C-alpha cells in the first residue's frame, strides 16, 4: 500500500530528527530522498530511506517544490492534524507522555489502575450474571 513518491509523508526514525513529520519533495535515487517540513527547526535535507518510515499520508505536491510552497500546501491540506488524529500518532504521543512521568506520577498511575481493576472485575462478573 505504501510507496516512495513525491508528496509521501514520512516519519524520521534515526538521527537527530527522530520522531518528526516530513514530506518527500524529490527522489534523488533508490536510496536517498530530499525531504522537508514546515517546522522551523527542521531543515530541508537529503535523507536515506532507512532513516525514515512511510506514513499513509500522500500530499499533492509538485516535484522539487521549495520550502515556501511545501509549507503552504502542507497547511492547505490537513497534514499536521491528519497525522495527529491517527492510532499511530496517538500511540507515539502516549509513549512520549509515558517517558516523562516522575516517581510521583508513576505512583498516581498505580493508584488509578488499582481503582480501574476493582471496577473492571465487578463489571465483568455482572455481565456474566446474564
Amino acid at each position: 500500500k505504501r510507496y516512495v513518491e513525491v508528496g509521501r509523508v514520512v516519519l524520521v526514525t534515526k538521527g537527530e530528527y527522530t520522531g518528526k513529520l516530513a514530506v518527500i519533495v524529490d527522489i534523488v535515487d533508490h536510496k536517498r530522498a530530499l525531504i522537508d517540513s514546515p517546522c522551523s527547526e527542521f531543515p530541508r535535507q537529503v535523507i536515506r530511506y532507512g532513516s525514515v518510515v512511510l506514513t499513509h499520508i500522500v500530499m499533492k505536491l509538485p516535484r522539487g517544490a521549495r520550502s515556501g510552497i511545501v509549507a503552504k500546501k502542507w497547511k492547505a491540506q490537513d497534514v499536521c492534524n491528519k497525522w495527529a488524529s491517527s492510532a499511530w500518532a496517538k500511540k507515539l504521543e502516549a509513549k512520549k507522555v509515558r517517558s516523562q512521568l516522575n516517581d510521583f506520577d508513576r505512583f498516581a498511575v498505580m493508584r488509578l489502575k488499582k481503582q480501574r481493576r476493582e471496577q473492571v472485575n465487578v463489571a465483568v462478573a455482572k455481565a456474566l450474571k446474564a
Binding site: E93, K95, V97, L101, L112, V120, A123, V124, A127
Partner: protein, 196 residues
C-alpha cells in the same frame, strides 16, 4: 536486558549458527536455555549442499576403532547441540557447565508447551536471508541422514496445535470481556493524561 532464570526459544525459522552463537553466549552468561522445535531450524544454502556437508562429517571416523570415533548424532536437536558445543570451551569445566544448562528438543514436549516461547531476532531467517536465497530445514536434513522420528513429531505437533488453538480461543474470549469492562470505566480519563 534478559536476565531471567530460564528462557524457552522457539527454534522454528531460525538460522542454525546464528541461533547457536546467541545461545552459547547466553549460556556463558549463566542463562538456562530451552530450545524447542529444533526440527524447524533452517540452514542457508540449498538442500543438496547442506546434505553433502553432513555426509562429509559422517566420513570422519577413527580408523582403528570407530567406536572411539566421532559420534555423528542425526536428530535435529543434536545437530543444534553440536553447533552450540563447538562455540563453547567445552573441554573446560566452565564450558561443560554452560553446555549442561542447555536443553534442546524436537517438537514441544509437555513441560514447555504451556510456557511462553520467545524468538531471537538476530537469528531469524526472514530477517537475515535475502528473499530468493535457497535454504533448508534441519528436520528434512536429519530425516535423510538416519533420524527416525519426523512422522511421530509431526503428528504430535498437529495435536499440540489443536489444543493450543483451543487454549488461545478461550483466552481470546476472556480478554474480550475484560477489555469491554475496561474501556467503559470512568477512570480512563485520568489514566489518559498519564499516557495510559
Amino acid at each position: 536486558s534478559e536476565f531471567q532464570k530460564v528462557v524457552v526459544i522457539d527454534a522454528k525459522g531460525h538460522l542454525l549458527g546464528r541461533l547457536a552463537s546467541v545461545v552459547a553466549k547466553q549460556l556463558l552468561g549463566g542463562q538456562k536455555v530451552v530450545v524447542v522445535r529444533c526440527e524447524e531450524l533452517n540452514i542457508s544454502g540449498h538442500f543438496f549442499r547442506n546434505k553433502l556437508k553432513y555426509l562429509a562429517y559422517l566420513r570422519k571416523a577413527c580408523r582403528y576403532n570407530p567406536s572411539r570415533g566421532a559420534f555423528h548424532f542425526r536428530a535435529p536437536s543434536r545437530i543444534f547441540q553440536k553447533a552450540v558445543r563447538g562455540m563453547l570451551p567445552h573441554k573446560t569445566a566452565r564450558g561443560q557447565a554452560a553446555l549442561e544448562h542447555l536443553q534442546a528438543v524436537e517438537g514441544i514436549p509437555p513441560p514447555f508447551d504451556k510456557q511462553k516461547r520467545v524468538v531471537v531476532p538476530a537469528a531469524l531467517r526472514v530477517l537475515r536471508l535475502k528473499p530468493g536465497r535457497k535454504y533448508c530445514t534441519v528436520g528434512r536434513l536429519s530425516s535423510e541422514v538416519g533420524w527416525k522420528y519426523s512422522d511421530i513429531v509431526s503428528k504430535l505437533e498437529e495435536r499440540r496445535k489443536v489444543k493450543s488453538a483451543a487454549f488461545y480461543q478461550a483466552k481470546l474470549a476472556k480478554q474480550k470481556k475484560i477489555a469491554s469492562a475496561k474501556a467503559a470505566s470512568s477512570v480512563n480519563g485520568k489514566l489518559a493524561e498519564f499516557g495510559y
